[PDB]
Structure 1
Amino acid sequence: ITGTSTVGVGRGVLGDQKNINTTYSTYYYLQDNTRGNGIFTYDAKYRTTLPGSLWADADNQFFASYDAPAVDAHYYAGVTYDYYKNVHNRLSYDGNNAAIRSSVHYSQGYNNAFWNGSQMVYGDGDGQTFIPLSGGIDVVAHELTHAVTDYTAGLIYQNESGAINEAISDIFGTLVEFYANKNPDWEIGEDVYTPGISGDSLRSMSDPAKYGDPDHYSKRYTGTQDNGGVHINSGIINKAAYLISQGGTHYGVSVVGIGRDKLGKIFYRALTQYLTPTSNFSQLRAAAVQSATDLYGSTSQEVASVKQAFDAVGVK
């Protein structure tokens, strides 16, 4: 909408106060004009028709319980935009400052979040498996990264390419969480998963097997559920990425860590210059090796560590 840029204040899902960029024209809208061609957050009003209505508020204060998922979807989309722009010189998900749209309060009791081809969508959870999913910065960044993938490599959402697609979203979700630097970890979704259970998470990148996901290619899922295991087999790639960054010895194979920033550079280059819609795990290894070679040189520690990490997870 046309209006003047304003700064509201509110509380997110976890109870934390934050400032949010809004737009004033009669109402204060969740429309952040400070980033690209805008970040826009919508109310789906417990229904499934999208996007719903652009979030309108009378007083620019967002402290109601109903407001909290909107505050966080809006704010964490901004953090994710900043990560891609400042770290990778990428302007929004399409590279040309496309408007970023999110809807919250999608459906009833909805234990998921997704990119629908055009926008991000967040359930409120049922209060048992999830609380409102936009409360997780890694979750928000995971969703926006699906849009990045779709505009770049275009990894088909099934089987190995789909597990790579998933892992890319978990990797960059985690790197955005570290960028913001509030309680960062290598776990996925811990801030919004299972409010009655402390210390767990939806997935672990450091130890995928803690939640039953494979940490070696020989343990990959080969059935048809979950689009051929896209949220399961992602563990193999998540573990490789974790090892590249942090190092470790896994199934007897030692990996020298090179840190998160270099992990992000390698995987961003692989995603945007080498992967294709049909890339499989072996082709991801080759893309990561080539990316590290481009950035650091063929004789570099970074190339050697990429090879060690894929060896450790059984991907040749």
Structure 2
Amino acid sequence: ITGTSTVGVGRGVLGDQKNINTTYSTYYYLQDNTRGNGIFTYDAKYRTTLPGSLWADADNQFFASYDAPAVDAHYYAGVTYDYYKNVHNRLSYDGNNAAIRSSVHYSQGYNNAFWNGSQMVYGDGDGQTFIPLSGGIDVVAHELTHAVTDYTAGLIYQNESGAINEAISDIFGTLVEFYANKNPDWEIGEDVYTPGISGDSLRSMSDPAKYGDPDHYSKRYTGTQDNGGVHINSGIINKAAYLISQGGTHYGVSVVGIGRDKLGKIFYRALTQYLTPTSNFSQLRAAAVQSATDLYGSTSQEVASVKQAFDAVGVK
């Protein structure tokens, strides 16, 4: 909408207070004009029609319980935009400052979030498996990263390419969580998963097997569930990424860590310069090796550690 940029205040899903960029035109809208061509947050009103209505508020204060998922979807989309711009010199998901749109209160009891090809969508959860999923910064950044992937490598959402697609979203979701520096970890979704169970998460990148996911290519899932295991086999690549950053010895193979920033640079370059829609795990290894070579040199520790990490997870 046309209006003037304003700053509201509210509380997110976890009860924390934050300032949000809004727009005033009769109402105050969840429309942030400070980033690209805007960040827009919509109310799906418990239905499945998308996007729903641009979020409107009478007073620019967002402290109602119903407001909380919208506050966090809006705010964390801003953080994710800032990460891509400041760290990778990428302007929104298309590189040309496309408007970023999210809908919250999608459906009833909906234990998921997704990019639908055009926008982000967040359920409220059922209160047992999830609380409203935009409360997780890693979740929001996971979703926006699907848009980045779709505009760049275009990894098809099945089998190995789809598991790479998933891992890219978990990697950058985690790197955004570290960028914001509030309780960062290498787990996925911990802030919104299972409110009645402390200390768990949906997936672990540091130890995928903690939640049943493979941590070595020999343990990959080969069936048809979950589009050929895209959220399962992502563990193999997540583990490789964790090892590149943090190091470790895994199935007897030792990896010298090079840190999160270099992990992000290598994978961002791989994603945007070398991967293709049908890349498999072996092709990802080659793209990461080439990317590290471009950035750090063929004889660098960074290249050596990329190779060790993929060896450690059984990807040649």
By the TM > 0.5 criterion, same fold? yes
Q: CA deviation at 1:185?
A: 0.1
Q: CA deviation at 1:308?
A: 0.1
Q: CA deviation at 1:53?
A: 0.0
Deviation per residue, 1:226-256 (Å, 9 max, x gap): 0000000000000000000000000000000
Deviation per residue, 1:112-169 (Å, 9 max, x gap): 0000000000000000000000000000000000000000000000000000000000
CA distance in 1, matches of 2:285, 2:128: 38
CA distance in 1, matches of 2:308, 2:34: 42
CA distance in 2, matches of 1:260, 1:196: 31
Tell me the percent identity: 100
Deviation per residue, 1:202-240 (Å, 9 max, x gap): 000000000000000000000000000000000000000
Q: CA deviation at 1:31?
A: 0.0
CA distance in 2, matches of 1:305, 1:100: 35
SS of 1:165's equivalent in the other structure is helix
Q: Which residue in the other structure is 2:44 paired with?
A: 44
SS of 1:42's equivalent in the other structure is strand
Q: CA deviation at 1:282?
A: 0.1
CA distance in 1, matches of 2:248, 2:297: 23
Q: CA deviation at 1:94?
A: 0.1
SS of 2:196's equivalent in the other structure is coil
TM-score by length of 2: 1.00
CA distance in 1, matches of 2:87, 2:11: 27
Q: CA deviation at 1:37?
A: 0.1
Q: CA deviation at 1:87?
A: 0.1
TM-score by length of 1: 1.00
Q: CA deviation at 1:105?
A: 0.1
SS of 1:173's equivalent in the other structure is helix
- How many residues in Structure 1 have an aligned counterpart in Structure 2? 316
SS of 2:35's equivalent in the other structure is coil
Deviation per residue, 1:246-279 (Å, 9 max, x gap): 0000000000000000000000000000000000
Deviation per residue, 1:52-109 (Å, 9 max, x gap): 0000000000000000000000000000000000000000000000000000000000
5+ residue gaps, structure 1, are none
CA distance in 1, matches of 2:262, 2:14: 31
CA distance in 1, matches of 2:211, 2:183: 21
5+ residue gaps, structure 2, are none
- Over the aligned positions, Cα root-mean-square deviation in angstroms equals 0.1
Point out 4+ residue stretches in structure 1 off by more than 4 angstroms.
none
Q: Which residue in the other structure is 2:270 paired with?
A: 270
Q: CA deviation at 1:5?
A: 0.2
CA distance in 1, matches of 2:202, 2:128: 13
CA distance in 2, matches of 1:147, 1:308: 30
CA distance in 2, matches of 1:58, 1:122: 23
CA distance in 2, matches of 1:123, 1:226: 19
CA distance in 1, matches of 2:219, 2:193: 25
